[PDB]
């Protein structure tokens, strides 16, 4: 959740309908948009941010909602336009091969800047003490992780969470709607829409 990938999409035709084809028990909460009107507006670049946050912290992944995971790992301003999907994958992620495969951070010297990654290496500092790169009192690794055993409750299973950002800058006609066809019939006087002409 502290080191999240950011994929940059290019000119294409995004079909926002396969999002609800995966395994059940998945959220589709949007902010500022709607899935019914998703394929109506035009966006230049869409960014996908994948992270493995789980538990009762998906509700606080929203503009103006702090918490314990969206406080020093991911911050969203009050302008987010996208839909978050948090389907649960408790079949290929939770395994006994390794419990520290995923990571998780904690409090820092300051709050994270919205939409900024905080890949660090340095050890945490309590404010007044010599660390010297050792694991002692008041100097410990803030990357406190958790285990993933295939016996936990519903509130601790691996949740694959990915958010989508919708930007709108001075750009040409980029991704906007999958398509729209109506099985053209040629027998009478009827309306037509040939890619703009109405």
């Amino acid at each position: 959740v502290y080191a999240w990938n950011r994929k940059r999409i290019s000119n294409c035709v995004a079909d926002y309908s396969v999002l609800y084809n995966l395994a059940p028990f998945f959220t589709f909460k949007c902010y500022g948009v709607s899935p019914t009107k998703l394929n109506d507006l035009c966006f230049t670049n869409v960014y996908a941010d994948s992270f493995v946050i789980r538990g009762d912290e998906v509700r606080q992944i929203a503009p103006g909602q702090t918490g314990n995971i969206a406080d020093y790992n991911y911050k969203l301003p009050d302008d987010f336009t996208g839909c978050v999907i948090a389907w649960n994958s408790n079949k290929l992620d939770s395994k006994v091969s390794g419990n520290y495969n995923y990571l998780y951070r904690l409090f820092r010297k300051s709050n994270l800047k919205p939409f900024e990654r905080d890949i660090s290496t340095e050890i945490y500092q309590a404010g007044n003490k010599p660390c010297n790169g050792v694991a002692g009192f008041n100097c410990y690794f803030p990357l406190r992780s958790y285990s993933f055993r295939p016996t936990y409750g519903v509130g601790h299973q691996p949740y694959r969470v990915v958010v989508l950002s919708f930007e709108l800058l001075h750009a040409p006609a980029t991704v906007c709607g999958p398509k729209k066809s109506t099985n053209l019939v040629k027998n009478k006087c009827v309306n037509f829409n040939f890619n703009g002409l109405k």
Partner: antibody
Amino acid sequence: EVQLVESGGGLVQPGRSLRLSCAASGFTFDDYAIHWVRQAPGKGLEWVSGITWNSGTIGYADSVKGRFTISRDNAKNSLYLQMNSLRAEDTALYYCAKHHQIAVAGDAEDYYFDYWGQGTLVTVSS
Amino acid sequence: YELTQPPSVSVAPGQTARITCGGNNIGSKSVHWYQQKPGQAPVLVVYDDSDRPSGIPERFSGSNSGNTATLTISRVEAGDEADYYCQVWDSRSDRVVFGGGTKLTALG
């Protein structure tokens, strides 16, 4: 073509920490997995960790869990590996190996290295 | 997993060599090989026991049958003396299991 230059490495006291880097050049740092593998002098190699094309950890060894943390930075095209609580059995040539396949979405997990580098001698003693 | 390799295999430069890597039930998972010149960086050799990368001649070959993967190198020369390793995935433990490489030395 591919130039996997590796930076970071030297003499450090047992129990300290350091940051290793591997700046990629020649290919696209968004579709090829890069791993970390050490090689003790004249005592074979040993896989440390690795990350896929996206930000994803593929696991560690049976002796580096909890102490090592690998991170990927697609913006600067460089792979980083954090080492905590180094001991006497961590003196080896840590390499920066890439992957041949493009790691398509629907396949089977099978990673094999194709491009190798030179490595940095990370010696840990008093 | 745990792979077992011969500590050293020598052969005259007139015939082929026999480098094997055996395990417990390694009959379906892919078997990859590597060659590392002494001092230089490890180079890639025939992988998946069914194809070779670009640049490797036809002399290098591989084959797996049940619990033994044989890296059959043909017409071994002096410039082929290197440390050969075999790779496996072992998705059961989410690791990359290597093994003690074999020091191929052209005798004679």
